Amino acid sequence: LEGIRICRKGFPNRILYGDFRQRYRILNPAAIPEGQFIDSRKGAEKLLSSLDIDHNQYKFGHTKVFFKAGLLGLLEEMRDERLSRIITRIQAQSRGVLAR
Amino acid sequence: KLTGAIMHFGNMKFKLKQREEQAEPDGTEEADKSAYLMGLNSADLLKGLC
Amino acid sequence: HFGATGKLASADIETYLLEKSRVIFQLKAERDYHIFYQILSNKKPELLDM
Amino acid sequence: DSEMAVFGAAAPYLRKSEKERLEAQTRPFDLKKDVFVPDDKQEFVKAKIVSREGGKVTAETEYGKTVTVKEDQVMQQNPPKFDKIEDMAMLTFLHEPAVLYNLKDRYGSWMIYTYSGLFCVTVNPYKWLPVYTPEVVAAYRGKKRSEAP
Amino acid sequence: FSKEQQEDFKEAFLLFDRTGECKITLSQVGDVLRALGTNPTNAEVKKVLGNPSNEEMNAKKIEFEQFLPMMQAISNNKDQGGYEDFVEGLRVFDKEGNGTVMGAELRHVLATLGEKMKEEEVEALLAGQEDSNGCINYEAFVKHIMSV
Numbered sequence: 423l424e425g426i427r428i429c430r431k432g433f434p435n436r437i438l439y440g441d442f443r444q445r446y447r448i449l450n451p452a453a454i455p456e457g458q459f460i461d462s463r464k465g466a467e468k469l470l471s472s473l474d475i476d477h478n479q480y481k482f483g484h485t486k487v488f489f490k491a492g493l494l495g496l497l498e499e500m501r502d503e504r505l506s507r508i509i510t511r512i513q514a515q516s517r518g519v520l521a522r
Numbered sequence: 523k524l525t526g527a528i529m530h531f532g533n534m535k536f537k538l539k540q541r542e543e544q545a546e547p548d549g550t551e552e553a554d555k556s557a558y559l560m561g562l563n564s565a566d567l568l569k570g571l572c
Numbered sequence: 573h574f575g576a577t578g579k580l581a582s583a584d585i586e587t588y589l590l591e592k593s594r595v596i597f598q599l600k601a602e603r604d605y606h607i608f609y610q611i612l613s614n615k616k617p618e619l620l621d622m
Numbered sequence: 623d624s625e626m627a628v629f630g631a632a633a634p635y636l637r638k639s640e641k642e643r644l645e646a647q648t649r650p651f652d653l654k655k656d657v658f659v660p661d662d663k664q665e666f667v668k669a670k671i672v673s674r675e676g677g678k679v680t681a682e683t684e685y686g687k688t689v690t691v692k693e694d695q696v697m698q699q700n701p702p703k704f705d706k707i708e709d710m711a712m713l714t715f716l717h718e719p720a721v722l723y724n725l726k727d728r729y730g731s732w733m734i735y736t737y738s739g740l741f742c743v744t745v746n747p748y749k750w751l752p753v754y755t756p757e758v759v760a761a762y763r764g765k766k767r768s769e770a771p
Numbered sequence: 772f773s774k775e776q777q778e779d780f781k782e783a784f785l786l787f788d789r790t791g792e793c794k795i796t797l798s799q800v801g802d803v804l805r806a807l808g809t810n811p812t813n814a815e816v817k818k819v820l821g822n823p824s825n826e827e828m829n830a831k832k833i834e835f836e837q838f839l840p841m842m843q844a845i846s847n848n849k850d851q852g853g854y855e856d857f858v859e860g861l862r863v864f865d866k867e868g869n870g871t872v873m874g875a876e877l878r879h880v881l882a883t884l885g886e887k888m889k890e891e892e893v894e895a896l897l898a899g900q901e902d903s904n905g906c907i908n909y910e911a912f913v914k915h916i917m918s919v
């Protein structure tokens with residue numbers, strides 16, 4: 423019961439700004455344009471603001487981003503949906519030029 | 523770029539944890555500037571260094 | 573343990589505290605370790621000879 | 623659920639049947655009146671509010687026994703739409719009887735595993751479910767906690 | 772498209788039609804529109820057809836005048852992925868991070884996990900593109916397949 427009390431109220435999910443950028447950049451490459459420098463903190467700020475999810479679910483730490491109980495699962499669902507979308511669309515390209 | 527990174531690499535600031543005597547970056551802006559130049563990642567660079 | 577490619581590469585077993593006294597003392601409604609009764613129950617002639 | 627077919631014969635022993643889904647929307651339940659009350663032989667029992675008397679309340683329990691307890695010790699029942707949820711962190715009202723009865727309604731139907739947010743609770747079946755043979759392992763490959771039961 | 776665009780689109784069907792003038796390939800035509808225009812997911816082709824039968828896919832041949840609108844409709848599905856969108860894809864298969872993808876798991880991924888592909892094409896697309904260590908410079912593979 424106490425563990426649920428903290429999971430519901432607190433911020434059980436947490437990502438380093440670098441591993442967050444590395445892993446979920448596939449979620450919105452335009453929010454974090456590469457080829458140009460952008461600090462880890464403001465990058466994560468722009469990407470998560472771009473996700474259009476409920477902004478009351480997260481707060482930012484000195485070195486890790488912090489999420490409410492139910493967000494991280496939704497982010498992994500989102501990422502695997504995108505990886506499916508993309509591997510099928512790269513296959514769209516692979517078949518398109520192979521057919522060319 | 524490598525000369526520049528060796529310049530930035532001295533600007534990375536590290537702070538000791540309150541009890542583990544382990545280095546964590548406060549000056550993350552200098553570490554991600556360095557990694558951006560050397561083509562590493564800020565997190566795995568900092569994790570490897572510390 | 574898994575490799576960089578993610579395939580199984582090894583496994584390590586670690587043990588912390590075997591109830592070594594159970595080998596010699598048990599309360600009512602409980603057994604000693606299973607090895608002894610499982611060996612005895614089949615009366616496997618090769619093991620019952622060894 | 624048509625997607626349950628991937629577990630074969632193990633499927634009835636992991637997730638509730640389609641009838642339990644339809645029954646949930648038809649259960650008689652009142653959020654303001656249905657509450658749990660403590661009992662002697664069993665920690666909590668369902669009860670029905672019958673009246674209001676300011677700071678003192680009186681209610682009739684499911685076994686027809688009369689009870690009087692102050693409002694500080696009465697906990698509202700969870701609505702039937704959240705009964706047997708797979709993760710107890712998703713319960714709406716969280717208290718000692720909500721977890722007790724959430725485990726009891728699942729375990730009485732041999733659905734032995736249930737999550738509790740960052741951790742999971744497993745209740746000893748004592749009788750086997752064909753939930754441990756090779757075929758289920760393939761169903762669990764790469765599936766996430768949101769997908770697999 | 773220009774009126775001179777539809778003519779050169781037409782003669783693709785005119786070479787692929789083995790009939791003297793009543794064929795266009797219901798099973799193979801969408802596959803060719805990738806070359807003349809942009810490339811969709813096959814499921815979107817099936818959705819514009821309205822989910823036909825597999826036996827239809829093997830036996831049916833469709834009429835070209837109804838297909839001219841289909842050319843535009845199949846061209847219509849925008850939000851195709853860009854270069855960075857594609858190059859971050861195969862990095863999740865890259866369990867090293869250096870810029871190489873082993874072909875033993877690359878062909879596995881391309882064959883088993885996404886939409887179906889004719890496997891001989893998967894054999895011959897990477898053939899000659901491998902290195903001596905048995906990997907692929909996927910940022911080159913993507914800048915290969917986006918360009919030509």
Ligand SMILES: CC(C)n1c(=O)cc(N[C@@H](C)c2ccccc2)[nH]c1=O
Pocket residue numbers: 434435436437441442445494498
């Ligand atoms: C606090 C803990 C539960 N946690 C996380 O909350 C997230 C982690 N890593 C990220 C990068 C990740 C998210 C989801 C699946 C895999 C990895 N690590 C973690 O250690």
